[PDB]
Amino acid sequence: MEKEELKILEELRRILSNKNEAIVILNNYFKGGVGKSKLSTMFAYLTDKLNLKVLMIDKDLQATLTKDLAKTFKVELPRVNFYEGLKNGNLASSIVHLTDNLDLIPGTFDLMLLPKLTRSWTFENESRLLATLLAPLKSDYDLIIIDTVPTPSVYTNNAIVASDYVMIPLQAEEESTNNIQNYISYLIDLQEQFNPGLDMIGFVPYLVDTDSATIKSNLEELYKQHKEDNLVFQNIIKRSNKVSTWSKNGITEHKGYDKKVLSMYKNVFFEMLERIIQLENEKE
């Protein structure tokens, strides 16, 4: 499994043993179609292979992650759906078991009822709801990985307030400095009010065309912009036909290019862990 990857996992497990509860990671950005749900699926898959105990959370009406995971894993309907769990103030009956390692709180269209549920609440109580209900679950997991909508909403606010770390997938050529700074301002707003320890892991570039001069050049410029803070991931995600195959048939390892495309996701995953480890080692 490579020595360096083994060392990263040992270090993760050591940090988790010090923390004594899960680290919560959010994949988020306000553009659709940049691979947030796909990264989430591939992280679920990889963590299960690595025997990490993980809770995936699909906080999207569309339930994209849930339906995608169901291509590879047996995904049951939960006794109580995510929206009803939130309404009941307990998420315990909303968890399904994909493997002995991998759990999921599935998405449901009933999440559309959430903003009405919380309409009369204080902004604080609305925004802290997910965090409050995740708190008792964290001792049961190594990682909790949240996927949600791209539109600023009750969903995004809950996800951000519940998380320790945020991964930001984006297409460099589609974003401007202003876009990124505005998005970061949104995170800062919620961090200061409700979640001061929130950290950005970094930006995860998505490259839809490997033979595009403008795509290459915009990516170069993003790296330049973030030379000092080092926020741009060194390992990136490239569009692959293989992902389309896995989205139809389920994820496999025994076919041509399966292991090569898997290593692309693995390299992002491990870079994410490295970045988390560095931040955790710095921490209080």
Ligand X SMILES: Nc1ncnc2c1ncn2[C@@H]1O[C@H](COP(=O)(O)OP(=O)(O)OP(O)(O)=S)[C@@H](O)[C@H]1O
37 is in an annotated binding site: yes
Distance CA 133, CA 149 (A): 19
Q: Give the CB-nearest residue to Mg ion.
A: 37
Instruction: Compare residues 150 and 250 and give the one whose CB is closer to ligand X.
Output: 150
Q: Please give the residues from 23 up to 62 whose contact with Mg ion meets the rule CB under 5 A.
A: 36-37
Give the one residue of 99, 153, 240, 245 binding ligand X; rule: CB under 6 A: 240
Instruction: Count residues near ligand X (CB under 6 A).
Output: 15
Spatial separation of the C-alpha atoms in residues 156 and 205, rounded to whole Å: 21
DSSP state of 77: P
Largest CA distance in the chain: 54
8 A C-beta contact, residue 163 and residue 146: yes
Q: Which of 28, 64, 108, 163 binds Mg ion (CB under 5 A)?
A: 64
- 82 lies in the site for its own copies, by CB under 8 A: no
* Interaction residues for ligand X, span 141-170 (CB under 6 A): 150
| Long-range pairs of 112-116 with CB within 8 A, sequence gap ≥ 24 | 112/61, 112/83, 113/83, 113/87, 114/83, 114/86, 114/154, 114/155, 115/153, 115/154
For the bound state, the minimum distance from the C-beta of residue 62 to its own copies, rounded and expressed in Å, comes to 6
87 closest CA partner among 49, 27, 129: 129
Unique residue bearing structure tokens 């708190």: 135
Closer to its own copies by CB, 19 or 31: give it.
31
Instruction: Compute how many residues bind its own copies; rule: CB under 8 A.
Output: 28
Task: Select 58 or 280, whichever has its Cβ closest to its own copies.
Answer: 58
Count of residues making up the chain: 284
Select from 15, 143, 149, 261 the one that contacts its own copies (CB under 8 A): 149
CA separation for the pair 194, 216 (Å, rounded)? 38
Mark 183-222 with x for binding to ligand X (rule: CB under 6 A) and - for no binding: ----------------------------------------
Q: Can you say whether residue 31 is alpha, beta or left, with left for phi > 0 and alpha for psi between -120 and 50 degrees?
A: beta
Which residue in the set 47, 64, 156, 163 belongs to the binding site for ligand X (CB under 6 A)?
A: 64
37 is a contact residue toward ligand X (CB under 6 A):
yes
Site residues (vs Mg ion, CB under 5 A): 36-37, 64
Residue positions forming the annotated binding site for Mg(2+): 37
List residues binding ligand X (CB under 6 A).
Answer: 32-38, 64, 150, 237, 239-240, 243-244, 247
